[PDB]
Coordinates of C-alpha atoms in Angstrom, one line a residue:
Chain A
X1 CA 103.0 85.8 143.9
X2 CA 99.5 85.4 143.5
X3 CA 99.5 87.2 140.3
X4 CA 98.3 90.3 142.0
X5 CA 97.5 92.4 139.6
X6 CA 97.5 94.3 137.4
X7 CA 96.3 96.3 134.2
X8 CA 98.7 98.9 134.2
X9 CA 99.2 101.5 131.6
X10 CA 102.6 101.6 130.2
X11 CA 101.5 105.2 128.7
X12 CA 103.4 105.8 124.9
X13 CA 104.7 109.3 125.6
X14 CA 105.5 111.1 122.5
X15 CA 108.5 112.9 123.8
X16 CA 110.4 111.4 120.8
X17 CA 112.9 114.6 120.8
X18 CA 110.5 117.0 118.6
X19 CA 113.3 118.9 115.9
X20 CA 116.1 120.4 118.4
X21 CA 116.9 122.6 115.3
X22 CA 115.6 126.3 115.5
X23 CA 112.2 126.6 113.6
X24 CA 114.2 128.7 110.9
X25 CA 116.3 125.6 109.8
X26 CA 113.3 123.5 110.5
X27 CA 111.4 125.6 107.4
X28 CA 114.9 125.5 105.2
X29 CA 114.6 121.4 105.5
X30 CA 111.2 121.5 105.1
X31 CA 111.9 123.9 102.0
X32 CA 114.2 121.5 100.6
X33 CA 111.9 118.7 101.2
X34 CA 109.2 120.1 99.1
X35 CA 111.8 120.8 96.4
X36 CA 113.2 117.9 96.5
X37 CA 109.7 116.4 95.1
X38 CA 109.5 118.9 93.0
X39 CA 112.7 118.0 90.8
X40 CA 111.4 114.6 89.7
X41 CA 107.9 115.3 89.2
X42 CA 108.4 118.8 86.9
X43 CA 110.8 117.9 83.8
X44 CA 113.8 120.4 83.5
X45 CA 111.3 122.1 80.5
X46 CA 109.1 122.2 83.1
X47 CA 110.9 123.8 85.5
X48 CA 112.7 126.4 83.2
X49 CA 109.0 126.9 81.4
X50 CA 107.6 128.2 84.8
X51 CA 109.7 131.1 84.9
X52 CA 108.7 131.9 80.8
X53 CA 105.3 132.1 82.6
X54 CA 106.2 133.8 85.9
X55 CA 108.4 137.0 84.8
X56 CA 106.2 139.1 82.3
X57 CA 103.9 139.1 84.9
X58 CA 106.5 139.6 87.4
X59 CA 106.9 142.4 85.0
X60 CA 108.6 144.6 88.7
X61 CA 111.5 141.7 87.7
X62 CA 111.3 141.5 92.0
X63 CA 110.9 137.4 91.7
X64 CA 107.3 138.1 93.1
X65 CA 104.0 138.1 91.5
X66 CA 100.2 138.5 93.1
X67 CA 98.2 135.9 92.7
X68 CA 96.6 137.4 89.7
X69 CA 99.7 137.0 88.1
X70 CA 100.1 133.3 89.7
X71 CA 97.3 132.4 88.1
X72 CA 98.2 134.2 84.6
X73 CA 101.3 132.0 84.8
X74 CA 98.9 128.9 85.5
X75 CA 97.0 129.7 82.3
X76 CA 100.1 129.9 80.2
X77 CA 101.0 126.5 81.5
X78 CA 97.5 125.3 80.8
X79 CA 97.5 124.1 84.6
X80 CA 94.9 125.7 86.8
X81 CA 93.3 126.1 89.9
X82 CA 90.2 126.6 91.6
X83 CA 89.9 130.4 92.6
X84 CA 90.0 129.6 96.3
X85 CA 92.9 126.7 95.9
X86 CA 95.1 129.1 94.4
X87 CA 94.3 132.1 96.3
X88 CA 94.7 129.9 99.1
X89 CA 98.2 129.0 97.9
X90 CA 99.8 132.1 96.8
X91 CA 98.3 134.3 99.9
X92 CA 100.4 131.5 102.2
X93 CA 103.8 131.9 100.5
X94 CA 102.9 135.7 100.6
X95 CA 102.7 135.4 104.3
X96 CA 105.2 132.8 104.6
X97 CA 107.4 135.7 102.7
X98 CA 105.9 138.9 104.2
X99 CA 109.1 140.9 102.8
X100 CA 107.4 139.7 99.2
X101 CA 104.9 141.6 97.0
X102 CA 103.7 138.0 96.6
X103 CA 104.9 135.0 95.7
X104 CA 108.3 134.0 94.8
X105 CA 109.6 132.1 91.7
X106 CA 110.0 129.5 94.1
X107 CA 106.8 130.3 95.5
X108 CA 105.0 130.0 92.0
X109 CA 106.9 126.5 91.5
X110 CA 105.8 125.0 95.0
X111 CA 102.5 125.9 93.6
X112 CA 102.2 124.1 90.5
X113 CA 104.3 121.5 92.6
X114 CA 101.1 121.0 94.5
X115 CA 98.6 121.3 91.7
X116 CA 100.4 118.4 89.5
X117 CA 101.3 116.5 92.5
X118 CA 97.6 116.2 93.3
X119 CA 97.5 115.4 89.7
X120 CA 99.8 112.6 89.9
X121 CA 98.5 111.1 93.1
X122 CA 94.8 110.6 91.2
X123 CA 97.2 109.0 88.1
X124 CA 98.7 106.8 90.7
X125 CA 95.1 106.3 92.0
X126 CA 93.2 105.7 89.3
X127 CA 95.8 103.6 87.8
X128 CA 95.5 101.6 91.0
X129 CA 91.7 100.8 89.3
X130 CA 92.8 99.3 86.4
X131 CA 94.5 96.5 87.8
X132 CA 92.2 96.1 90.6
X133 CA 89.5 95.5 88.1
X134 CA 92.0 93.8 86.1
X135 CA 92.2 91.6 88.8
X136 CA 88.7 91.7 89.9
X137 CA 87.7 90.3 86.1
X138 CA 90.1 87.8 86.3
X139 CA 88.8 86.1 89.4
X140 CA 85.5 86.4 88.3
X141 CA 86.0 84.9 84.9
X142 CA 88.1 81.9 87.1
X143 CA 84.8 81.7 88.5
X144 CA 82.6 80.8 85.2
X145 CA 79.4 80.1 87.7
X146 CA 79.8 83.9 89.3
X147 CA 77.5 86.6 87.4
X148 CA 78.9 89.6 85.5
X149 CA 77.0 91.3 88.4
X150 CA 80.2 90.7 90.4
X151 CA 82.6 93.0 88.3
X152 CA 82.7 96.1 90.1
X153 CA 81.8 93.8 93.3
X154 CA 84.6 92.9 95.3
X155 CA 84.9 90.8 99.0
X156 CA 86.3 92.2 102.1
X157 CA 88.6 89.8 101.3
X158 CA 89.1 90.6 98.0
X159 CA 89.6 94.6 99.2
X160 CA 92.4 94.7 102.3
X161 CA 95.7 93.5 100.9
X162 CA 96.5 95.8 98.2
X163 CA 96.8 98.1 100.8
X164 CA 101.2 96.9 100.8
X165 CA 101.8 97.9 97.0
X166 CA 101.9 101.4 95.6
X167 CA 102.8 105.0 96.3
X168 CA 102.8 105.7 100.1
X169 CA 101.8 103.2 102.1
X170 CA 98.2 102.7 103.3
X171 CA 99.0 100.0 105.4
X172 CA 96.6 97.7 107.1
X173 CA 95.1 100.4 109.9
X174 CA 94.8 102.4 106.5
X175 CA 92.9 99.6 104.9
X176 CA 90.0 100.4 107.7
X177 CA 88.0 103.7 106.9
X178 CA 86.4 102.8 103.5
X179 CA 84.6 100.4 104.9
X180 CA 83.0 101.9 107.3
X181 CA 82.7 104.8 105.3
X182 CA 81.0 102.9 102.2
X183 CA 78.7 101.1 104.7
X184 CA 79.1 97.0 102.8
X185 CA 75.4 96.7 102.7
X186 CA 75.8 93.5 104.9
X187 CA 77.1 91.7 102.1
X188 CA 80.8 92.8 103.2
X189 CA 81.3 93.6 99.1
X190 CA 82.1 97.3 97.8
X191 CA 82.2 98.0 94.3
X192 CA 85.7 98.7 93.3
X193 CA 84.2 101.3 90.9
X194 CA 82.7 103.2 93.8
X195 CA 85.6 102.9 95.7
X196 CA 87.2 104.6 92.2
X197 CA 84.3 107.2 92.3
X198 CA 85.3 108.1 95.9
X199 CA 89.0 108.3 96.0
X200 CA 89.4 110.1 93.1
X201 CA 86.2 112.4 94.5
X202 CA 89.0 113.4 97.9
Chain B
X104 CA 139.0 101.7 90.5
X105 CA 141.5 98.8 89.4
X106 CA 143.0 98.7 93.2
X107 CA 140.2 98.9 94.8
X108 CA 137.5 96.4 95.0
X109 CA 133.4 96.9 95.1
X110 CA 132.0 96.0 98.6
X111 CA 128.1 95.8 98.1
X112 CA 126.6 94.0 100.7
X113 CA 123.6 91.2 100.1
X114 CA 119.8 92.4 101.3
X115 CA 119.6 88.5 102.3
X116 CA 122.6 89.0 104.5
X117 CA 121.7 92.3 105.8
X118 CA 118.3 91.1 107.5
X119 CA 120.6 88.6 108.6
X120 CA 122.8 90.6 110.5
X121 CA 119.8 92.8 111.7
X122 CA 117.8 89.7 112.9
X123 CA 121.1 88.2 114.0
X124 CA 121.8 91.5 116.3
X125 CA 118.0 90.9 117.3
X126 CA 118.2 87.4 118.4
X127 CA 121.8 87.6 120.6
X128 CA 119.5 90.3 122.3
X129 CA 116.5 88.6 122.9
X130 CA 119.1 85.5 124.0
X131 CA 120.5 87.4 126.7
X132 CA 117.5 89.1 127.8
X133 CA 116.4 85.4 128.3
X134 CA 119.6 84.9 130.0
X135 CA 119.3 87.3 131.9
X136 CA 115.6 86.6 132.5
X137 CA 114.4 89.5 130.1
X138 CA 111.6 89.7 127.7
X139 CA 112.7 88.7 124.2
X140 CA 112.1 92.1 122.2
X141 CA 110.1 92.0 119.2
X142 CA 110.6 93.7 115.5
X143 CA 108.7 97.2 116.0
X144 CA 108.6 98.5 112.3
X145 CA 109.0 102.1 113.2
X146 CA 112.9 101.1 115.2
X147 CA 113.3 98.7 112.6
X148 CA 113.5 101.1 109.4
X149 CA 114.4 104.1 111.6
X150 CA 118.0 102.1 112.4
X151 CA 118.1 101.1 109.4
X152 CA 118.1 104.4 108.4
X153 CA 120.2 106.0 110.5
X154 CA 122.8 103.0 110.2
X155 CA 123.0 103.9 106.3
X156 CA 123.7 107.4 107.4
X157 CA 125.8 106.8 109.9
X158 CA 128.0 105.1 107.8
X159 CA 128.8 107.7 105.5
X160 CA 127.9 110.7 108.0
X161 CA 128.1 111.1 112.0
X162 CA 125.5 111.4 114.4
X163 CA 123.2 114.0 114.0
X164 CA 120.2 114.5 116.4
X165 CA 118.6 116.9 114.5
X166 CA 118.7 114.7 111.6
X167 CA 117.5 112.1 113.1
X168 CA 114.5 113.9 114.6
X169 CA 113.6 114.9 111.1
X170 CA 114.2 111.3 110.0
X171 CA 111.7 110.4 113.1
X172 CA 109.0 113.3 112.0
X173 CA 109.2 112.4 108.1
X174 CA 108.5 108.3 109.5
X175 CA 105.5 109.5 111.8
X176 CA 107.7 108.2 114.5
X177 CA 105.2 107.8 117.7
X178 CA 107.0 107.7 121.7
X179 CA 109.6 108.0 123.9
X180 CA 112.7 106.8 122.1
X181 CA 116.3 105.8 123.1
X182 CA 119.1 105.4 120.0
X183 CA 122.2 102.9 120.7
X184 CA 124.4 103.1 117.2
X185 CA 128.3 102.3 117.1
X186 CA 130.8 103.0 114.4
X187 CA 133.9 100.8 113.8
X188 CA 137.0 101.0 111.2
X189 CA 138.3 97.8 109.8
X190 CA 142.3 96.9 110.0
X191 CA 144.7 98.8 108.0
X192 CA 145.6 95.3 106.7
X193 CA 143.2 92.9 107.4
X194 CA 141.3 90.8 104.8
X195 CA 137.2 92.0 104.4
X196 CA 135.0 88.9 103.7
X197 CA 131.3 88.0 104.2
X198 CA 131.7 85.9 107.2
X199 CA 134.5 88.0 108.7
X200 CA 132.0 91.0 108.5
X201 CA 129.4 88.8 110.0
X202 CA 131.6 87.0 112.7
X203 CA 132.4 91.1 113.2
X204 CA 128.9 91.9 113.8
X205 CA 128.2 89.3 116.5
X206 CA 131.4 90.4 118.2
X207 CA 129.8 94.1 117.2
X208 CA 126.3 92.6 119.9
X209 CA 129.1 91.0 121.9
X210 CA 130.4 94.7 122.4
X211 CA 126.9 95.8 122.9
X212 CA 126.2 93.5 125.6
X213 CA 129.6 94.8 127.4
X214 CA 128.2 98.2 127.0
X215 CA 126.4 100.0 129.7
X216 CA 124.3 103.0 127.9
X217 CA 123.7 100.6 124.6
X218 CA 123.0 97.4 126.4
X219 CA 120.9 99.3 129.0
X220 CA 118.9 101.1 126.2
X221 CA 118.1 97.1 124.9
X222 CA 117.4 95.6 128.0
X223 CA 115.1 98.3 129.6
X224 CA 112.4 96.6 131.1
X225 CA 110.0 99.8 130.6
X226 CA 111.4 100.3 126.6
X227 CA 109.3 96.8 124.3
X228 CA 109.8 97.8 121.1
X229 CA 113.1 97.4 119.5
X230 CA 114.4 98.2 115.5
X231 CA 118.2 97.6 113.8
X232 CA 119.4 98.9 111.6
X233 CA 123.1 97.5 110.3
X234 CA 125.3 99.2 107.5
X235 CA 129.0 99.6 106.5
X236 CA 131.3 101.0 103.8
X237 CA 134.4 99.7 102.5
X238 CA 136.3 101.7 105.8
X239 CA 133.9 101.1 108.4
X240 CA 130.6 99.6 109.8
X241 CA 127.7 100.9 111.9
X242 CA 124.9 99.3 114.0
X243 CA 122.1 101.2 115.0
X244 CA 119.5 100.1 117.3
X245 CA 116.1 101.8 118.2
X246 CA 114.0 101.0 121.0
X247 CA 110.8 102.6 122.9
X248 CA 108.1 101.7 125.5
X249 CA 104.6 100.8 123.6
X250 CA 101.8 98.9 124.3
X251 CA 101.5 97.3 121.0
X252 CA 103.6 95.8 119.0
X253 CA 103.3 93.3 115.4
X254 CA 104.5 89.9 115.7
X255 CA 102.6 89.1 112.1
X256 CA 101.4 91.3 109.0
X257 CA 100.9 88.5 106.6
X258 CA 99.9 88.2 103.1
X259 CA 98.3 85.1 102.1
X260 CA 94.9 86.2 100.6
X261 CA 95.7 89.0 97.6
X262 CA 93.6 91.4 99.2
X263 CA 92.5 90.5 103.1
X264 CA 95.3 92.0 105.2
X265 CA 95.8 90.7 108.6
X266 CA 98.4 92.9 111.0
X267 CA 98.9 90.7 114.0
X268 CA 99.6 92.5 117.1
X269 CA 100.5 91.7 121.2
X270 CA 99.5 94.6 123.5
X271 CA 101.8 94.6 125.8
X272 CA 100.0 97.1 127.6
X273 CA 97.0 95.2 130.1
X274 CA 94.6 98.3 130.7
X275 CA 95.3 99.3 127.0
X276 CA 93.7 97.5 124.3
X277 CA 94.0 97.9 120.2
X278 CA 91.2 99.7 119.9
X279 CA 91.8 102.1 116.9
X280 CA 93.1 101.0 113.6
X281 CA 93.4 104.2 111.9
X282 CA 95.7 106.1 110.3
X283 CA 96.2 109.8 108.0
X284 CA 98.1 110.3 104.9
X285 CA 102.0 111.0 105.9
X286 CA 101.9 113.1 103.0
X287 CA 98.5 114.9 104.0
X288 CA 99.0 114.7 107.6
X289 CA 95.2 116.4 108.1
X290 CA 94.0 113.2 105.7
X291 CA 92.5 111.0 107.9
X292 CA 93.3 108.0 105.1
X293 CA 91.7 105.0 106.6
X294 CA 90.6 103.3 109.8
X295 CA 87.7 101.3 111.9
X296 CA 87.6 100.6 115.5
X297 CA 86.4 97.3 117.6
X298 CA 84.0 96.1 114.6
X299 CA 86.2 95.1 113.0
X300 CA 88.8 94.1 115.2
X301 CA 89.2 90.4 116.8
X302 CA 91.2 91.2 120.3
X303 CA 92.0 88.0 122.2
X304 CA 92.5 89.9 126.5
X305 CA 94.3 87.4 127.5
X306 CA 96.9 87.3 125.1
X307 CA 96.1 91.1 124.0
X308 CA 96.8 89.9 120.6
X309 CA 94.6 91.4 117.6
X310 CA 93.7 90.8 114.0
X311 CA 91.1 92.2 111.6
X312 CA 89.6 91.9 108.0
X313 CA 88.4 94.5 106.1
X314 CA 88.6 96.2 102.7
X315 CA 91.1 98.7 100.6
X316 CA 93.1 98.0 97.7
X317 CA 96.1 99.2 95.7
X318 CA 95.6 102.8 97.1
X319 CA 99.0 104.2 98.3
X320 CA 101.6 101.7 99.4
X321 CA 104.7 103.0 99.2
X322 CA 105.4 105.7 102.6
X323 CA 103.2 106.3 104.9
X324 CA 103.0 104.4 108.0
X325 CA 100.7 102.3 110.7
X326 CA 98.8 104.2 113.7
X327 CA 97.9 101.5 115.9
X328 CA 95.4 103.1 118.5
X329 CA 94.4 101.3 121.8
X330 CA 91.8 101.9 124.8
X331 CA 91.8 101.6 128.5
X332 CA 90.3 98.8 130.0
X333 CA 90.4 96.4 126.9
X334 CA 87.1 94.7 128.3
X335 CA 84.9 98.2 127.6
X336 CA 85.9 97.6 123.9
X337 CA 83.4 96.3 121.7
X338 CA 85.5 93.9 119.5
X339 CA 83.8 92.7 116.6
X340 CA 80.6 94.1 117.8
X341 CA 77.8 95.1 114.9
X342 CA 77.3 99.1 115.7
X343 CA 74.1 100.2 115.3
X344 CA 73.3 101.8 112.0
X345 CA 73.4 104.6 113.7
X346 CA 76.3 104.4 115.3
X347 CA 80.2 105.0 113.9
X348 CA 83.4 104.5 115.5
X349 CA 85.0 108.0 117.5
X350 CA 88.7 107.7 117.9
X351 CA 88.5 111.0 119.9
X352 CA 88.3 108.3 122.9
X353 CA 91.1 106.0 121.0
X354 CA 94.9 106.6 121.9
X355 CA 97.6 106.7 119.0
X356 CA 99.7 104.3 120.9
X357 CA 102.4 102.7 117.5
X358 CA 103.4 104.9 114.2
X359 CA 105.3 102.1 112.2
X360 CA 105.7 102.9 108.9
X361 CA 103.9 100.4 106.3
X362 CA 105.9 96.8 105.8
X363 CA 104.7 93.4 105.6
X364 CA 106.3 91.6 109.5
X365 CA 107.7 89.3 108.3
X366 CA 107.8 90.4 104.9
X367 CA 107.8 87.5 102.7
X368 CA 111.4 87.9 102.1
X369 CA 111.9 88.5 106.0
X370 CA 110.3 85.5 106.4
X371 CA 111.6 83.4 104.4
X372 CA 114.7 84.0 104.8
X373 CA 114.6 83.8 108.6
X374 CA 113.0 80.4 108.1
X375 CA 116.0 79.6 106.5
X376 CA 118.1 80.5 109.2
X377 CA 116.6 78.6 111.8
X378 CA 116.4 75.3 109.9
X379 CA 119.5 75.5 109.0
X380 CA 120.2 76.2 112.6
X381 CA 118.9 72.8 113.7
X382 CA 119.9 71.3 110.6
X383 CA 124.0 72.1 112.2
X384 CA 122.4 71.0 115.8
X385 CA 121.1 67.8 114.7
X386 CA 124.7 67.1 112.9
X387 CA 126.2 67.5 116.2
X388 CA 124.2 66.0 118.0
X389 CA 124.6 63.0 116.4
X390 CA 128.4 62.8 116.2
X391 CA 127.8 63.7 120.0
X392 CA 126.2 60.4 120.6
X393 CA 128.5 58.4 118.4
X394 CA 131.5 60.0 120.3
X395 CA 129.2 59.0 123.8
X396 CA 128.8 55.5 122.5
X397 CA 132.1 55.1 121.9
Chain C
X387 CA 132.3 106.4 68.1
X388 CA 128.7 105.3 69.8
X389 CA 129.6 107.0 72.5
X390 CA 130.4 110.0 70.9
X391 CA 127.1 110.0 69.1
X392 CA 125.3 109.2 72.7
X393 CA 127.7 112.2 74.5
X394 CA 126.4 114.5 70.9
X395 CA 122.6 113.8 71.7
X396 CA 123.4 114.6 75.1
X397 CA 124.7 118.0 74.4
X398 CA 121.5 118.6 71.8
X399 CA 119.1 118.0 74.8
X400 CA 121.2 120.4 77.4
X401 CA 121.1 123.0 74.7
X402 CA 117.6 122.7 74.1
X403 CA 117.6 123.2 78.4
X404 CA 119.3 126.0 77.7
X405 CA 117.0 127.3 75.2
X406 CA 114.9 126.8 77.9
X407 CA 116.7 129.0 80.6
X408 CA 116.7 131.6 77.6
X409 CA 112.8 131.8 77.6
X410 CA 113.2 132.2 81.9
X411 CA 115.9 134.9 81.1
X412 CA 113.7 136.8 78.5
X413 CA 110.9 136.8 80.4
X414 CA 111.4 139.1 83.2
X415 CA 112.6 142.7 81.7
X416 CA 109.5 143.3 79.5
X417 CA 109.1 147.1 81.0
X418 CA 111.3 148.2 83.7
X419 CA 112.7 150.8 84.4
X420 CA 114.1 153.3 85.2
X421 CA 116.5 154.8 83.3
X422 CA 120.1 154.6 83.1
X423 CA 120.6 158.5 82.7
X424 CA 123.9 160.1 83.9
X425 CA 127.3 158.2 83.9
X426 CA 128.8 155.4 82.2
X427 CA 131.3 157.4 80.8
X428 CA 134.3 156.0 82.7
X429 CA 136.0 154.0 79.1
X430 CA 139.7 154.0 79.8
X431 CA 141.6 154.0 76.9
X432 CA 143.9 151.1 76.4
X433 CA 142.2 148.8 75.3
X434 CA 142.2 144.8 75.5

């Protein structure tokens, strides 16, 4: 009795069984994972246009290509990457397949997996400002006595809770950063437009 | 297809069952003088998970490690799931399969490794998951020791989030809300520290406001971070202009992935539950008294 | 019959795919190699 104490630290251990499964299966899951993506966001054309891209300069007919010939393929698909984006990405498939004179077929569809998945997550993003203007005008104009000023301005909030609606889940701990990234100029109101400016900026 | 008959299964009734299994838990841990266990997101849609795959599939650990990496899953966990075939000529209805699940917590409460997983003093944070096919049914249930866990994520301003939290930890406090990108596990997404946090000690309990809109919602998951000494933390506190938040210091301490608690539907529902709970008490109650009087 | 139509619109589409795989297929062989030089003789003669 005597309520004794005490602040003790029930200590979250993350000994959550890490993947049992030798690293080799590990990277075939992961493999598939990737792919899995892949399907839905390249069409079928897409995906049997890659290859029309890939081969001639795969011209060895070895499934592999340099990144010269990555990038060739990029080109011909009017998708392209930075220099050191796409270096970057076919020199870790080459290594990730050192038994490859480069990358892969799959290896050159992983990449443009990345390069219009980044795509679509700014579509997704930048969608996301249309109705949050949308919105933002709306309230505004249900508020005749507000200035104009105010579109673009937005409260604190006005800026958390469509953090629980699209794409993969920024949940309230990733509603935080912004803020204190942005710096509300004590007024505890961030442009939505910056906020645009910045996220599709990352 | 003309024999047999479709089976599908209400989303109404299955946060039923799950909150159903919950409560028969959290009644016996009461019975048994136990603390009632609280809906962590991460057991929550884990079980639910693995239920759905249990159903169709058996146990697989590495499976469900994978399942558990994919979710951001964060701490010791222990898995209590159970697969059962229906009579080879027995009638299948709604309230036969739910009568079935409480006798389903019934058999959980008579088992030692499952009912010991649930009532673990140490363990706080408990998810189900229940699912079935045509042939069978499967409960799966989740738990782990944390020091925080969300009693309320609530959504009644359009864009001012409010994640309530009890740490059930007393030299831990939330500290750090902060998470990365599931996706982009090296994107640190979005979080802010004791600024803009309001942590009640005594109660350990937390809420914030703060600002980011319809910017990926769909995945990714909730890193709840928490510090020693809950006092040291500034809560609330204006930092300096010169002065920004270091989670370096700041334990991950809950990875739940992303879902309104209670979601409105959760919610709602539940409320429906209870009142018609005392709704059926009140009833017999009062042919109680009549039956008294006479 | 609307079926049939839907099933024929269906089969246009997965022969366009296949047009498709035909560009992957004739992509690949523009140079090599290495010539096929000494025996394929081996032609039995009954034929099919």
């Amino acid at each position: 009795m005597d309520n004794t104490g005490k602040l003790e630290k029930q200590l979250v251990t993350l000994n959550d069984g890490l993947p049992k499964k030798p690293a080799k299966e590990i990277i075939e899951e992961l493999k598939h994972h990737l792919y899995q993506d892949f399907q839905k966001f390249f069409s079928e054309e897409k995906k049997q246009q890659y290859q029309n891209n890939f081969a001639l300069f795969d011209r060895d007919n070895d499934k592999y290509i340099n990144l010269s010939e990555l990038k060739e393929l990029l080109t011909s698909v009017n998708i392209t990457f930075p220099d050191d984006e796409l270096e970057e990405l076919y020199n870790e498939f080459c290594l990730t397949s050192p038994e490859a004179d480069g990358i892969n077929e799959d290896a050159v569809f992983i990449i443009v997996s990345k390069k219009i998945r980044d795509n679509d997550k700014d579509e997704q993003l930048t969608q996301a400002f249309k109705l949050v203007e949308k919105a933002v005008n709306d309230e505004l104009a249900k508020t005749p006595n507000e200035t104009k000023e105010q579109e673009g301005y937005i409260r604190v909030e006005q800026f958390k809770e469509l953090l629980m609606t699209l794409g993969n889940r920024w949940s309230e701990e990733q509603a935080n950063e912004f803020l204190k990234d942005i710096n509300p100029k004590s007024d505890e109101r961030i442009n939505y437009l910056d906020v645009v400016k910045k996220l599709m900026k990352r | 297809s003309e024999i047999s008959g479709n089976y599908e299964a209400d989303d109404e009734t299955l946060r039923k069952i799950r909150r159903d299994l919950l409560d028969n838990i959290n009644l016996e841990r009461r019975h048994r003088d136990l603390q009632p266990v609280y809906i962590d997101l991460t057991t929550n849609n884990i079980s639910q998970y693995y239920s759905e795959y249990l159903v169709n599939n058996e146990h697989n650990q590495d499976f469900y490690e994978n399942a558990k990496v994919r979710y951001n899953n964060l701490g010791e966990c222990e898995l209590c799931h159970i697969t059962a075939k229906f009579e080879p000529d027995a009638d299948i209805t709604k309230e036969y399969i739910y009568d079935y699940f409480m006798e389903i917590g019934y058999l959980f409460l008579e088992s030692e490794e499952e009912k010991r997983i649930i009532l673990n003093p140490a363990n706080n944070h408990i998810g189900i998951g229940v699912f079935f096919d045509e042939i069978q049914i499967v409960v799966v249930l989740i738990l782990s020791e944390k020091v925080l866990c969300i009693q309320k994520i609530s959504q009644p301003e359009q864009n001012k989030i409010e994640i309530r939290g009890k740490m059930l930890d007393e030299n831990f406090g939330i500290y750090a809300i902060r998470i990365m990108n599931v996706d982009d596990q090296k994107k640190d997404i979005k979080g802010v520290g004791p600024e803009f946090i309001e942590y009640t000690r005594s109660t350990q309990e937390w809420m914030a406001s703060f600002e980011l809109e319809l910017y990926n919602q769909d995945r990714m998951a909730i890193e709840y971070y928490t510090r020693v000494s809950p006092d040291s933390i500034p809560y609330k506190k204006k930092q300096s202009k010169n002065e920004k938040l270091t989670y370096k210091h700041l334990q991950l301490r809950l990875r739940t992935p992303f879902q309104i608690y209670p979601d409105p539907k959760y919610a709602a529902e539940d409320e429906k539950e209870r009142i018609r709970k005392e709704q059926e008490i009140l009833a017999h109650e009062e042919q109680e008294r009549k039956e008294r009087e006479e | 019959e609307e079926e049939f139509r839907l099933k024929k619109e269906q089969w246009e589409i997965q022969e366009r795919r296949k047009k498709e795989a035909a560009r992957c297929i004739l992509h690949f062989l523009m140079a090599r190699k290495e010539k096929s030089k000494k025996k394929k003789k081996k032609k039995g003669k009954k034929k099919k």
